[PDB]
Each structure stands twice: as structure tokens, then as C-alpha cells.
Amino acid sequence: LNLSPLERSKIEKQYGGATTLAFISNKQNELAQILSRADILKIASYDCAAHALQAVLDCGPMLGKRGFSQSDIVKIAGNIGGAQALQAVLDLESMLGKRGFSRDDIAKMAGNIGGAQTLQAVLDLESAFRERGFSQADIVKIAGNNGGAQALYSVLDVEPTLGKRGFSRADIVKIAGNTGGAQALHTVLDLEPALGKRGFSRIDIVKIAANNGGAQALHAVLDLGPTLRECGFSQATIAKIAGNIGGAQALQMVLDLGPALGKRGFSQATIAKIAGNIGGAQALQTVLDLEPALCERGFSQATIAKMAGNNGGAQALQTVLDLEPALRKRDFRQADIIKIAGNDGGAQALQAVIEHGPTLRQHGFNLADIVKMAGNIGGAQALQAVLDLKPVLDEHGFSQPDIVKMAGNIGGAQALQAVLSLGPALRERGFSQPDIVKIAGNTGGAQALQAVLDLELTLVEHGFSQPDIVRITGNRGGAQALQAVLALELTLRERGFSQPDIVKIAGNSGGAQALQAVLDLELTFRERGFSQADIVKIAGNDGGTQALHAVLDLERMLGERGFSRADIVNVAGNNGGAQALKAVLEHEATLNERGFSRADIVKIAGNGGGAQALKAVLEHEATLDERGFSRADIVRIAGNGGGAQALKAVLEHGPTLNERGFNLTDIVEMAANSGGAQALKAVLEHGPTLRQRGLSLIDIVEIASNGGAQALKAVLKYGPVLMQAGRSNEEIVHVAARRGGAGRIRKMVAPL
């Protein structure tokens, strides 16, 4: 073929290169029958390639007939000693085939330097290995990386001893599989007894030895270990540090750099963490080298330690030092830079921001959006995915906030890709685009989308609706929850649970566990006096699993303290139920002391955020008592959703309202509904205005108590217009002072 002067002169430099070029020219037709152009040039890129190419002509045709690819031929011939290796294959492929070695295995082994001797060694030792329980695949791994005959004999020599010392064949092959793995095996044999007495397990030894530089790592543990232990490092830490590639160097760096790092303020736990990742040695060194400059840029010590404590920690620090100026120019604050760099692969994320940031801005994303998308593990791939998929994202009709939402989580890149791949399919199934964004919009969203597509038909056929499915998979862990529904549906319904019960239990985060927990704990619940309906109520919220267990762990003490089964259910059966149930047991004696009945306690704790409501009563009951509020007033105020906030509102705004003419009874009335806090604040801020316009305090109390803040704002907004139209205060109050008062006001004001 037409070789450029570059392709030519590359070959000429090789020993016997001029002959190789000549051979190719003089034998171009013959070679073209067996190999492509690229195959020829690859083989030609080695010394004495003329011998190898001649061997291709002499062996190639037969090897083609015998099942060897062009790729295998190149692997064998394209190496030092390739001519000999290719001949060896042709002479031995048949016998090797008999022994259960595939074409691929034969080519792999022969692909080693001096592969001809590798193959002969295998034939000589195959029966020995087979007798000892090893497979053909093990032999290939042992022979790999130019292990050759020596690696095979090394394994045979040490195996029976390592066997007696409690090492598996899998451990042995794993260690042997690396470069210098045979030497690693001998090192294991020599050092294992001392390692064991120092306190290291077989597993730690195998793990340390099964990396490149493993033998050196084993030596480092024994020789550096004692000094590290004197420096306060445990054997578990030493093993973990040594357990990664470059483990030996990392241990030495802890020893060498440790003292100077501590004197700068870094703890030993921090030093160990930085060292315990791959590239820990470089990270430790980079900290010592770059910490002064980073501090001179303003980064705190804890910040530096955190960036270094992740995988790629060394790159993170270096990239942060390099990119920080340009990032700051783009008005990134230091905290944002830190957020982006403080994860695994932070360096790549920073570089992604620099590279893609400008384009992202032009697409409408702001700094916060970029920081959110890049500020996760895999942040670099998320930003990249956004730019690459943007035209398709635009076509499908996804908004920019939709993009930020499903890309702004861990796994965001995969979420975007999954939504473009599975989206149209799900829309044809009947799922809306906003529901698709919801499902894709959590970590694991890619799997959640797939789960829906896979299970939708079956679940619908069983009586579940598509909105039910959206509800179940629209949370974190959504795929698992849906899978749990499919798996456990039969059992739950056989036990007497309805499909809406199942949906409710599964329809919250942690739903997979909640479903299983209901199955596991139902019998125990019925025995302790609870009903199936109670179980659904308790498990049917966020943290339902913890709520159920909290019931089982606390029901005895609570019952003995005068709380009924119904009381327990009402307390535990809301969001944060486990905390509310615990708070009751913690404060019931003190609350009783302050004049609150069992029923009072249940009422206060029996709403969402019941624990905080209890806490708020204890913290404020004394002051409220002093001001003239009765125990019953306090219970009414705190005994609704948001009771803690309502209680605080009375505490903070009450006197002012009282100064203005509002009596305590009215204050209690305005506050003793859900959203009572908003009501009081609405009266505080807008009350004087309504009063100026001609509304009495009584009117204001009526509206605030029965219509809430919503109704007040509606009267504030539309009141003047209605008055000009001839409506009296009696009419406006009647219209507004009701649930939905805002809507009734709007209806009356409409024609104006």
C-alpha cells in the first residue's frame, strides 16, 4: 500500500527495518491475502519483523483454517519473538485444544514475550495444574503479563503450602494474575507468618498482594507498620492504606509527611483518610506542597483536608489552585468552587465548569444551576450530558428547570439519557411529561423510569392506576418500591390489605422497606391490640418503617403510663411519628406535672411535627400561663398542625395584638386553627389597615378565625371595591369569614 514517509521512516528505525519494508513490498500480494494494511504495519512495527511476516505467510493460512482470526494472528506475530510464537501455535494448537484451551486462550498466551516457551510450558504442566484443581482460565491468567514458564512453576511451588495456610486457589490466581504476580506469591509465602502475628488477616494479605506492586506493599506493612503503630495508626488503617494500588508508597508518605502535616494542624484521622484512597501518596504530597498557596488564596484547613480526602484528591487540589482565579473572575464565590471540588472527581467537575460554563450561561442556566449540577459526584458528566443532549432535550420539550432538576442529582447524566430513551415510550403509555420529570427527577431516576416501562402493563392489569405508579416511583428509591409492589402484591392482598393501602405504604420514600416491614410485623401488631388499619396508618408516612418499630419498642411503657392503643396510633401515625412517640415518653411526666392530661398530650403530639409541638409547649407554657392563657387554651393552640409555630406566634405577637384591643379569648380563637400562625401575622401586619377602612376588631376576629389569613388578604385586596359598590361590613364579613372565604370574596367582586 501507499506508505507515507512517516509510516516508512517509523519502520526504518527498527532493527532490520529496511528489510521489513522491502519484504512488505516484495510480498505485498501474498500478505494481502491474510492481513489488512493495518495488520501488516502493526507487525512491521517491531524489530526483525521480516521474520515475523515470513512466518505469517508460512503459518497464517493454516491458522485461518484452524479457527484463528486476523486479530489473533497479529497479537501473536506482532511482538518480540513473534516469528517463533506464531510457529509454536501452529505446532501446538491441536494438543492445546485437546486440553480444553480455546483459540482465544492460545492466542492470549502466545501473545506474551517469548510466547513460544509459554505454550510449551503450559503443555508440560497442564496435567499438574489440572490434578491440583486449577482450570484452563486460571492457567491463562497465571501465564499472562509475560509470566511465562516461571510464573507457572512459581504457582506449583507455593500452592500446596499456601493451601495449608488457608489460601484459596482463587486467592492464588488473583495474586498471580498481575505483573510480577509470581514474585508476589513467594513474598506472600515468606511474609504471611509475620503478617499474621502482627495482626493482619488472610483477606488483608491477599488484598494487599493482589495489586501491582503488591510484594513491595507487603514488605512496607512489616517494615513501616511498627513505626506507624507508634504514631497511633491501627492495623485496620494500615491494611486499608496498603490495600490500594501504590499502597507501599502511600504508607511511606504517611511516615514521611505525617509529622509535618500534623504540625500544620491536620489530625491523624484526616491523614489516614487522605492516604486510604487510590493515589493517597500523591494526595498527601500535594497537600503538603499546595496547602500554603491554597491558604494564601483563602481556603480553610478543613476545606483543603476535605478536597484531599476524596478519590482524585491530588488532582482536585492542583486543579483548584489553577482554576480558582478564572472561576472567581466569573463571579463564582469560594464556597461554590469548594462545593464543586469537594466530591470524587472534583477536578474534572471544575474543568467541566470552566469548559462548558460559558455555553451553559448562554442556554439560560445561571451560576446556581451550574453549581447544583456540577456539585455532585459525576458532576463533570452531568454538565457534559446537558450540552450533548440539549438539542434533543429541546425537541422533546423539556424546560430548563426540568433539566436542572434531573441532572442536579447524583447520576444526573444517566437520568438525562434515560429520559430521552424511555420518555417517548412512557408518553405513549399515557404518562404525562411532568410525571416523567418527577420520576427521573430523583437519584436512581434512570432505574425508576425503566421500572415503570417494565412493570406498568402488569400493575395496571392488577388494578393499580398510572397515577399510583407515578406516586410510588416518583420518590427516591422509586424503582425498588415499584419492584417491591410487584413482588409482594399477592401476599399483602391475601393478608387483607387493599390496593390503596399498598399504594399508600409504597408511595413514600423508604416504601420498599415499609411494605416488607408490614409483612414482617403484622402478626406482632395484631397480638398487641392494633388493627390492620392502624398498621397502614403508621407505615403510610415518610419513615413508616421507623414508625412501626418505634411503636413495637415503646407501646408497653406508653400503655402502662395511661395511653390507649388509639392514642399510640394517632401519635405515631403522622410524619415524624417515631420522634413524636419518643417525645411523648420523654415528656409525659413533666407535662402531667404542669397540668396537661393524657388526652392533652395526645392532642398536641398527634399531628405532624408533634414532637416540636410538645417541645414548644414545655418551653412556653410558663410564660403563657403568666400572661393569662389557660391550659386548655394552650392545648387548642398547640393541638393542630403547625402548633409549635402557632404557639410561638401568640408568644411573639400576642402582647402587641392585646395592646391594640384584641382580648386573649380572640387571640386564642385566631390561633387555635391550622394556619393560626399565618392568621396572627396577617392580623398583625394588615389589621390596622382594615381597621382604618372601617372594619371593627370583632369583624377582624371573625374573618381571621373562620377564613384565616387567606380571607383577610382577600378582604384587604378587594374590600375597598366592594364597599364602593354598596356592600356593608356585615356582608363582607359573612362572605369572607368561612373556609374558602377568599374564593367567596373573588366571586362577589368579579363583576367590578
Residue numbers in the entry: 15 to 766
The authors write:
In a search for putative DNA-binding domains, BurrH, a protein that recognizes a 19 bp DNA target, was identified. Here, its apo and DNA-bound crystal structures are reported, revealing a central region containing 19 repeats of a helix–loop–helix modular domain (BurrH domain; BuD), which identifies the DNA target by a single residue-to-nucleotide code, thus facilitating its redesign for gene targeting. We identified BurrH in Burkholderia rhizoxinica, a symbiotic bacterium found in the cytosol of Rhizopus microspores. Each BuD repeat is composed of 33 residues, only eight of which are strictly conserved between the repeats.
We expressed, purified and solved the structure of this protein, which is able to specifically recognize its DNA target. The models were refined to 2.21 and 2.65 Å resolution, respectively. BurrH shrinks 23 Å along the longitudinal axis wrapping the DNA molecule, which displays an almost unperturbed B-form.
